[PDB]
Amino acid sequence: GKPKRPRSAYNVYVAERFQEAKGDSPQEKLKTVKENWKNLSDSEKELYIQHAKEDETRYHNEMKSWA
Amino acid sequence: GKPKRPRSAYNVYVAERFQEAKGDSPQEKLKTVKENWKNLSDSEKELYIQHAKEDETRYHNEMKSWA
Ligand SMILES: [Cl-]
Ligand SMILES: [Cl-]
Ligand SMILES: [Cl-]
Ligand SMILES: [Cl-]
Ligand code: NA
Ligand code: NA
Ligand code: NA
Ligand code: NA
């Protein structure tokens, strides 16, 4: 099957943090994570982005190999 | 506003080629482009992917700068 584009750094962060985020409803948990992404340190941001970049490089290689 | 994730190489190709693709309906034009992406040369594939990678690097920088 066609390789799948990996999740962005911003979406990895929102998803990974959602389950423990709190409080009151899924809407409210999402709202707070989106705030938390905004207030990450530069070095934490940098780490999320580097991990996503690595996954994107793998995806690029897979597209080029894909039959 | 929040930086927008750039379009993937595969989606750039499908979109850019759609208008002149032919023939008979939008569905059929899409179906044919998707076929054409599959049969690109390695070097043409490589070029699309490098252009998308450049846009993704710019997006990474913009996220890291974004206030
Ligand atoms: Cl990203
Ligand atoms: Cl990607
Ligand atoms: Cl891509
Ligand atoms: Cl990206
Ligand atoms: Na830091
Ligand atoms: Na990963
Ligand atoms: Na080639
Ligand atoms: Na571009």
PDB file of C-alpha atoms and ligand atoms in Angstrom:
ATOM      1  CA  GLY A   1       0.000   0.000   0.000  1.00  0.00           C
ATOM      2  CA  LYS A   2       0.863   3.673  -0.451  1.00  0.00           C
ATOM      3  CA  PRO A   3       3.087   5.025   2.362  1.00  0.00           C
ATOM      4  CA  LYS A   4       1.205   7.252   4.793  1.00  0.00           C
ATOM      5  CA  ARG A   5       2.354  10.812   5.501  1.00  0.00           C
ATOM      6  CA  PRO A   6       3.499  10.957   9.130  1.00  0.00           C
ATOM      7  CA  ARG A   7       1.781  13.063  11.731  1.00  0.00           C
ATOM      8  CA  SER A   8       3.169  16.602  12.173  1.00  0.00           C
ATOM      9  CA  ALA A   9       5.109  17.598  15.302  1.00  0.00           C
ATOM     10  CA  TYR A  10       2.185  19.798  16.423  1.00  0.00           C
ATOM     11  CA  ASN A  11      -0.315  16.937  16.003  1.00  0.00           C
ATOM     12  CA  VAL A  12       1.985  14.405  17.704  1.00  0.00           C
ATOM     13  CA  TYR A  13       2.175  16.697  20.694  1.00  0.00           C
ATOM     14  CA  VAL A  14      -1.604  17.365  20.869  1.00  0.00           C
ATOM     15  CA  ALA A  15      -2.393  13.630  20.518  1.00  0.00           C
ATOM     16  CA  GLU A  16       0.240  12.305  22.937  1.00  0.00           C
ATOM     17  CA  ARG A  17      -0.701  14.753  25.679  1.00  0.00           C
ATOM     18  CA  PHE A  18      -4.493  14.541  25.292  1.00  0.00           C
ATOM     19  CA  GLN A  19      -5.252  11.447  27.464  1.00  0.00           C
ATOM     20  CA  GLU A  20      -3.758  12.841  30.689  1.00  0.00           C
ATOM     21  CA  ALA A  21      -4.484  16.512  29.875  1.00  0.00           C
ATOM     22  CA  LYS A  22      -7.695  17.225  31.808  1.00  0.00           C
ATOM     23  CA  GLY A  23     -10.034  18.552  32.755  1.00  0.00           C
ATOM     24  CA  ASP A  24     -13.672  18.380  32.000  1.00  0.00           C
ATOM     25  CA  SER A  25     -14.470  17.188  28.446  1.00  0.00           C
ATOM     26  CA  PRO A  26     -12.595  16.168  25.287  1.00  0.00           C
ATOM     27  CA  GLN A  27     -13.119  19.754  23.902  1.00  0.00           C
ATOM     28  CA  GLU A  28     -11.628  21.266  27.019  1.00  0.00           C
ATOM     29  CA  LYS A  29      -8.671  18.836  27.090  1.00  0.00           C
ATOM     30  CA  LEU A  30      -7.892  19.718  23.426  1.00  0.00           C
ATOM     31  CA  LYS A  31      -8.159  23.455  24.192  1.00  0.00           C
ATOM     32  CA  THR A  32      -5.601  23.104  26.995  1.00  0.00           C
ATOM     33  CA  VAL A  33      -3.087  20.988  25.078  1.00  0.00           C
ATOM     34  CA  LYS A  34      -3.179  23.510  22.204  1.00  0.00           C
ATOM     35  CA  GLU A  35      -2.318  26.129  24.840  1.00  0.00           C
ATOM     36  CA  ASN A  36       0.493  23.921  26.227  1.00  0.00           C
ATOM     37  CA  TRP A  37       2.076  23.499  22.762  1.00  0.00           C
ATOM     38  CA  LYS A  38       2.107  27.329  22.513  1.00  0.00           C
ATOM     39  CA  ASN A  39       4.124  27.648  25.763  1.00  0.00           C
ATOM     40  CA  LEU A  40       6.731  24.873  25.236  1.00  0.00           C
ATOM     41  CA  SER A  41      10.391  25.796  25.628  1.00  0.00           C
ATOM     42  CA  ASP A  42      12.377  26.298  22.434  1.00  0.00           C
ATOM     43  CA  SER A  43      14.366  23.095  23.095  1.00  0.00           C
ATOM     44  CA  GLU A  44      11.239  20.994  23.692  1.00  0.00           C
ATOM     45  CA  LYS A  45       9.619  22.379  20.528  1.00  0.00           C
ATOM     46  CA  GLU A  46      12.885  21.598  18.695  1.00  0.00           C
ATOM     47  CA  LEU A  47      12.800  17.978  19.868  1.00  0.00           C
ATOM     48  CA  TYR A  48       9.215  17.379  18.690  1.00  0.00           C
ATOM     49  CA  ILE A  49      10.036  18.937  15.314  1.00  0.00           C
ATOM     50  CA  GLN A  50      13.247  16.878  14.895  1.00  0.00           C
ATOM     51  CA  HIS A  51      11.354  13.669  15.609  1.00  0.00           C
ATOM     52  CA  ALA A  52       8.709  14.569  13.042  1.00  0.00           C
ATOM     53  CA  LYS A  53      11.425  15.503  10.525  1.00  0.00           C
ATOM     54  CA  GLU A  54      12.983  12.029  10.983  1.00  0.00           C
ATOM     55  CA  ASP A  55       9.641  10.360  10.320  1.00  0.00           C
ATOM     56  CA  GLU A  56       9.164  12.633   7.211  1.00  0.00           C
ATOM     57  CA  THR A  57      12.592  11.604   5.890  1.00  0.00           C
ATOM     58  CA  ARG A  58      11.629   7.939   6.285  1.00  0.00           C
ATOM     59  CA  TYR A  59       8.354   8.701   4.407  1.00  0.00           C
ATOM     60  CA  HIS A  60      10.311  10.403   1.619  1.00  0.00           C
ATOM     61  CA  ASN A  61      12.534   7.318   1.273  1.00  0.00           C
ATOM     62  CA  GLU A  62       9.502   4.998   1.276  1.00  0.00           C
ATOM     63  CA  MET A  63       7.768   6.991  -1.453  1.00  0.00           C
ATOM     64  CA  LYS A  64      10.877   6.821  -3.594  1.00  0.00           C
ATOM     65  CA  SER A  65      11.114   3.014  -3.064  1.00  0.00           C
ATOM     66  CA  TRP A  66       7.352   2.285  -3.253  1.00  0.00           C
ATOM     67  CA  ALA A  67       6.094  -0.033  -5.979  1.00  0.00           C
TER      68      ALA A  67
ATOM     69  CA  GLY B   1      -1.748  33.021  12.819  1.00  0.00           C
ATOM     70  CA  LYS B   2      -0.455  29.473  13.242  1.00  0.00           C
ATOM     71  CA  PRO B   3       1.837  28.384  10.370  1.00  0.00           C
ATOM     72  CA  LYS B   4       0.161  25.950   7.985  1.00  0.00           C
ATOM     73  CA  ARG B   5       1.696  22.545   7.242  1.00  0.00           C
ATOM     74  CA  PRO B   6       2.755  22.528   3.584  1.00  0.00           C
ATOM     75  CA  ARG B   7       1.224  20.234   1.026  1.00  0.00           C
ATOM     76  CA  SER B   8       3.001  16.878   0.542  1.00  0.00           C
ATOM     77  CA  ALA B   9       4.960  16.109  -2.638  1.00  0.00           C
ATOM     78  CA  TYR B  10       2.282  13.584  -3.685  1.00  0.00           C
ATOM     79  CA  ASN B  11      -0.521  16.137  -3.196  1.00  0.00           C
ATOM     80  CA  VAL B  12       1.426  18.915  -4.952  1.00  0.00           C
ATOM     81  CA  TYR B  13       1.801  16.656  -7.950  1.00  0.00           C
ATOM     82  CA  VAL B  14      -1.879  15.555  -8.027  1.00  0.00           C
ATOM     83  CA  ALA B  15      -3.085  19.174  -7.650  1.00  0.00           C
ATOM     84  CA  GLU B  16      -0.687  20.792 -10.135  1.00  0.00           C
ATOM     85  CA  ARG B  17      -1.410  18.247 -12.855  1.00  0.00           C
ATOM     86  CA  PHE B  18      -5.189  18.019 -12.368  1.00  0.00           C
ATOM     87  CA  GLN B  19      -6.358  21.002 -14.515  1.00  0.00           C
ATOM     88  CA  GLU B  20      -4.798  19.784 -17.781  1.00  0.00           C
ATOM     89  CA  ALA B  21      -5.072  16.055 -16.953  1.00  0.00           C
ATOM     90  CA  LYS B  22      -8.229  14.973 -18.803  1.00  0.00           C
ATOM     91  CA  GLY B  23     -10.423  13.383 -19.690  1.00  0.00           C
ATOM     92  CA  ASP B  24     -14.035  13.134 -18.840  1.00  0.00           C
ATOM     93  CA  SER B  25     -14.872  14.231 -15.265  1.00  0.00           C
ATOM     94  CA  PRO B  26     -13.045  15.466 -12.154  1.00  0.00           C
ATOM     95  CA  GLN B  27     -13.116  11.845 -10.761  1.00  0.00           C
ATOM     96  CA  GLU B  28     -11.542  10.511 -13.918  1.00  0.00           C
ATOM     97  CA  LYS B  29      -8.888  13.267 -14.063  1.00  0.00           C
ATOM     98  CA  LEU B  30      -7.917  12.487 -10.422  1.00  0.00           C
ATOM     99  CA  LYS B  31      -7.770   8.743 -11.186  1.00  0.00           C
ATOM    100  CA  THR B  32      -5.343   9.383 -14.055  1.00  0.00           C
ATOM    101  CA  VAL B  33      -3.042  11.779 -12.201  1.00  0.00           C
ATOM    102  CA  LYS B  34      -2.766   9.268  -9.330  1.00  0.00           C
ATOM    103  CA  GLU B  35      -1.678   6.761 -11.991  1.00  0.00           C
ATOM    104  CA  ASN B  36       0.822   9.278 -13.448  1.00  0.00           C
ATOM    105  CA  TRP B  37       2.435   9.885 -10.025  1.00  0.00           C
ATOM    106  CA  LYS B  38       2.916   6.085  -9.782  1.00  0.00           C
ATOM    107  CA  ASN B  39       4.871   5.997 -13.085  1.00  0.00           C
ATOM    108  CA  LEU B  40       7.152   9.055 -12.622  1.00  0.00           C
ATOM    109  CA  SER B  41      10.882   8.561 -13.111  1.00  0.00           C
ATOM    110  CA  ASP B  42      12.997   8.297  -9.971  1.00  0.00           C
ATOM    111  CA  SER B  43      14.583  11.707 -10.678  1.00  0.00           C
ATOM    112  CA  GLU B  44      11.220  13.432 -11.190  1.00  0.00           C
ATOM    113  CA  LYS B  45       9.855  11.874  -7.987  1.00  0.00           C
ATOM    114  CA  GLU B  46      13.055  13.030  -6.240  1.00  0.00           C
ATOM    115  CA  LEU B  47      12.521  16.614  -7.404  1.00  0.00           C
ATOM    116  CA  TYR B  48       8.923  16.796  -6.132  1.00  0.00           C
ATOM    117  CA  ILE B  49      10.007  15.348  -2.781  1.00  0.00           C
ATOM    118  CA  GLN B  50      12.968  17.766  -2.443  1.00  0.00           C
ATOM    119  CA  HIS B  51      10.698  20.733  -3.102  1.00  0.00           C
ATOM    120  CA  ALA B  52       8.243  19.537  -0.468  1.00  0.00           C
ATOM    121  CA  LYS B  53      11.114  18.928   1.975  1.00  0.00           C
ATOM    122  CA  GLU B  54      12.247  22.557   1.483  1.00  0.00           C
ATOM    123  CA  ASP B  55       8.753  23.830   2.234  1.00  0.00           C
ATOM    124  CA  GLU B  56       8.623  21.522   5.352  1.00  0.00           C
ATOM    125  CA  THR B  57      11.943  22.942   6.584  1.00  0.00           C
ATOM    126  CA  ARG B  58      10.553  26.470   6.220  1.00  0.00           C
ATOM    127  CA  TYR B  59       7.438  25.338   8.182  1.00  0.00           C
ATOM    128  CA  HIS B  60       9.651  23.878  10.915  1.00  0.00           C
ATOM    129  CA  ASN B  61      11.510  27.200  11.207  1.00  0.00           C
ATOM    130  CA  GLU B  62       8.231  29.153  11.288  1.00  0.00           C
ATOM    131  CA  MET B  63       6.811  26.978  14.058  1.00  0.00           C
ATOM    132  CA  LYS B  64       9.935  27.510  16.118  1.00  0.00           C
ATOM    133  CA  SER B  65       9.716  31.318  15.587  1.00  0.00           C
ATOM    134  CA  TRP B  66       5.901  31.607  15.875  1.00  0.00           C
ATOM    135  CA  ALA B  67       4.456  33.767  18.636  1.00  0.00           C
TER     136      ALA B  67
HETATM  137 CL    CL C   1       6.212  19.028  11.648  1.00  0.00          CL
HETATM  138 CL    CL C   2       6.042  14.563   5.014  1.00  0.00          CL
HETATM  139 CL    CL C   3       6.316  14.822   0.984  1.00  0.00          CL
HETATM  140 CL    CL C   4       5.804  19.247   7.627  1.00  0.00          CL
HETATM  141 NA    NA C   5      14.781  25.638  25.880  1.00  0.00          NA
HETATM  142 NA    NA C   6       8.454   8.722  14.896  1.00  0.00          NA
HETATM  143 NA    NA C   7      15.217   9.226 -13.478  1.00  0.00          NA
HETATM  144 NA    NA C   8       7.265  25.312  -2.306  1.00  0.00          NA
END
